[PDB]
Amino acid sequence: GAMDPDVRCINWFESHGENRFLYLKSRCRNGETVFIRFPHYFYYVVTDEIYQSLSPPPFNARPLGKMRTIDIDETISYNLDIKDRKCSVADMWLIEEPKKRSIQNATMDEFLNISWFYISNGISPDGCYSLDEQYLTKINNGCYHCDDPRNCFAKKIPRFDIPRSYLFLDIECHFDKKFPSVFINPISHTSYCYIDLSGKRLLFTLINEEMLTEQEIQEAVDRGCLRIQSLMEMDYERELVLCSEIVLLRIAKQLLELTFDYVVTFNGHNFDLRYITNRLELLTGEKIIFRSPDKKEAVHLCIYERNQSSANTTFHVNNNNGTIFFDLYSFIQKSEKLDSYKLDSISKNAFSCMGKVLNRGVREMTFIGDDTTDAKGKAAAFAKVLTTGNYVTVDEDIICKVIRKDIWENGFKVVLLCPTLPNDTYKLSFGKDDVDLAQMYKDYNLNIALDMARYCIHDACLCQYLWEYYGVETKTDAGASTYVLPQSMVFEYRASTVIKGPLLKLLLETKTILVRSETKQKFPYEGGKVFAPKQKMFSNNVLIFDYNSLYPNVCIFGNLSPETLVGVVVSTNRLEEEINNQLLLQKYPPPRYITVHCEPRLPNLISEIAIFDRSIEGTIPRLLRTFLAERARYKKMLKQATSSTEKAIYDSMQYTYKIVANSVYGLMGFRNSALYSYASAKSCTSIGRRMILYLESVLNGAELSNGMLRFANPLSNPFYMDDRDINPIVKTSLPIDYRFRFRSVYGDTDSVFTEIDSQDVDKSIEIAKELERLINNRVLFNNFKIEFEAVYKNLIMQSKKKYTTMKYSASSNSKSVPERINKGTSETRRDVSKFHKNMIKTYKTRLSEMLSEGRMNSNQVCIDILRSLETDLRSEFDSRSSPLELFMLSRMHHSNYDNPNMYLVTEYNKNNPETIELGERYYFAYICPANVPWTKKLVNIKTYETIIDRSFKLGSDQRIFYEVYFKRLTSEIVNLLDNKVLCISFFERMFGSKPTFYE
Ligand SMILES: [Mn+2]
Ligand SMILES: [Mn+2]
Ligand SMILES: [Mn+2]
Ligand SMILES: [Mn+2]
């Protein structure tokens, strides 16, 4: 009977007919769901003078107050004759119109209608409300209409928790050589993971009958599977069902038309759903049909795309029913920087745990994980994935099937089909079930269909595991709140669009409108500035300091905004440059104005100087100031809340404010954007770069002796003269006996790395904490602060992208387990051989000791270690004492997509008693005839790849083709060195080739 008036908004969505509306989907405290319909309007902002003129009057209008409208067009000046920026004030009107309308000079045109709805009616997209039933009339069951949302939604109330419904799905399609085409290839499996409002999980997979033998189908039935002849006969409590492809497809249609809250896939929008839909249209006549919650609009499922050059394309479903069809692949690309976006990689990273060993031998290891073994509930997370996972990865390398599993709420005991090297502990990774599908389909029988079924249900459940892991639900709500957007639009729309809501709110609060009355000239701030460490290998510890949100703070410091730009003053020669500078300093003095040297915009200009008035806070800095404040709030709320549901909400809010803040720098240089300002963007780049150089200049050559830190330069504010004590000799609270010396070793857009002549990590942390304090209190100024993140022992670094170190964090002490940090790399188990590993490990240990002598050029180390390499290499090529075991490499056999490796294994099988079967792990080496001398040409090495089995003995008339292994080894060694010209000389002489340098 009676509707519950207490609702929590969870999505908003539009119909698009000639007769169009806005719809809300909300959830009551009980679990009932209320859809509410609102009439659509198109909003326009006009001046009072325009309002009064309007041909027929607008449907409705609310005044906005007086508002300053400002010309933000950017102009360069060749002298200091800079005209004031055009500014007018007028009473403004927000007008509502049911049909689109062209208004000759309407302002605020960039902002979205949906944003105006929320702002105007005073409605938060994710809020909870006690609806005033007085303003709702019913129209279907469950669906009401609201002509007056302002009054209906007048009583906002605190957040209550709600349950939600999910369908996670994945499908498998047949193929042999080409990528599956809908016209010829059938769907073989469809797997579903349904989460009910109760929390109950339902797993079911439909297998396509038509790809099995009548005898096999009956075997499946005999074994436990349900066979069905139509949609009508489907029992959803059966985990395995056999049916025709047409039935399977009809079942998909029925599920996809249901009003789940979320339908979640990994690349389902471009593949899985597209395929189901087209295949259905082919085999029967049928479409998949979504309907608005009042049944007024129906649409056929049609996947559409959205484009965004900086770059990628994303795919979206057009359902008008309130369901959020959400693709994890698209999302994980937008919101994470990763080397792989394959699902096995993303899962490997997300789901790992530490495994203590209980049994050994046979071909079966056994592990346990729990709170004792890794962290609190890291094993709980792993154990949830194990419910459906069938292959675990041991120690980054060993893929190996599960044989049995015991799962409880906090830990897992798992037994695995692998080799044996049993230490007390090992790392366990998850992800897919790895297979060769192409072969599975070629040989397809019942036991393979069931295998694929288990593989497929897991890829679906990975979507629910990753959805929990990335906190998508709460991020969606936080997004919707902060961006002033429907939940469904939060990760669909691009960054230039999501910033517009909070910008609009700011412009309204500051009674300001920004108008670009001109075509923007073309140029962004592209430059491609990438940063090279002073040396690669570090004997000493390295201290890591991060600026705090540098670019947000730079904009705040300089008050960088299109409308606070007084002007830009350019010069083509030094006379103009000097005259202009001396006039600049007279007419626009600090501290009210800041003047910023930028890279000049034209090639004939020798200087470009942007001048900003700091007296009246600019739009952009204030936007950022809000975002940092809001983030700060939520970080506190995060620590004061204790319910893990609440922790998640506040953690998301906090994240959302980080992201939107960091979007701003980019948006200032993106031409199609509401925050575009070439000068501001360039000035921001430039001020930040200067802050890096200032910090570096002060620390590079700095020493701590007695109680005093002797900064290497005076602590002068780099932009203008300052109240602060520039004295670089500074009292510290460290021990008098301490004597240390600092070197600026690397620095980038926001981070600075400082070598200290010391290996004692406990002291290094003591000192770095003091450095932090003095940098923040004496070196820096205004809103510029650094954190001391960590100490880096045994840094070996090529760039910020490729580096390896042990990391003692700021919490850390001398004797807690570091964090091994590897980045960018490609090797381990048979990618590289034991000869190589042993040689790299020695040449590192010899080289780190060489840097602790202090006696070196770049060259005296470089000459010394390359003499050593020749001597060891020529020695092994002569003596040949090293076993073949040291030169063996491994590889998995599999079918094509690789091509010469099938020829390698085929011919081995075709010529030898043993067979290397199609998922076996086989060994090989680079072997050549003994009568080949030191070779500096090269061929396709693939000819000297030689399968080494148990009965292989090295010919009396063969040798290990040492050159292959040597060339690879000295490549890795010269990339540790610093003298480049000496290394290239060596490598052309020894190998007749020019080396790689990871740049
Ligand atoms: Mn898939
Ligand atoms: Mn799959
Ligand atoms: Mn930090
Ligand atoms: Mn066989």
Author numbering: -3 to 306, 314 to 900, 904 to 1005
Q: What does the publication say?
A:
Poxviruses (members of the Poxviridae family) are large double-stranded DNA viruses that replicate exclusively in the cytoplasm of the infected cell. The enzyme is a member of the DNA polymerase family B15 possessing DNA polymerase and 3′−5′ proofreading exonuclease activities. E9 alone was shown to be distributive under physiological conditions (adding fewer than 10 nucleotides per binding event) unless bound to its heterodimeric cofactor D4/A2012. A20 links both enzymes, and the DNA-binding properties of D4 are believed to increase the association of E9 with the genome template thus rendering the polymerase processive.
The end-joining reaction requires the 3′−5′exonuclease activity of E9 that degrades the extremities of dsDNA to create 5′-ssDNA overhangs. Larger differences in domain orientation between E9 and the archaeal enzyme make the model globally less reliable, especially since SAXS data are not available. However, the modeled DNA fits very precisely into the exonuclease active site of E9, in particular regarding the position of the catalytic Mg2+ ions replaced by Mn2+ in one of the E9 structures.
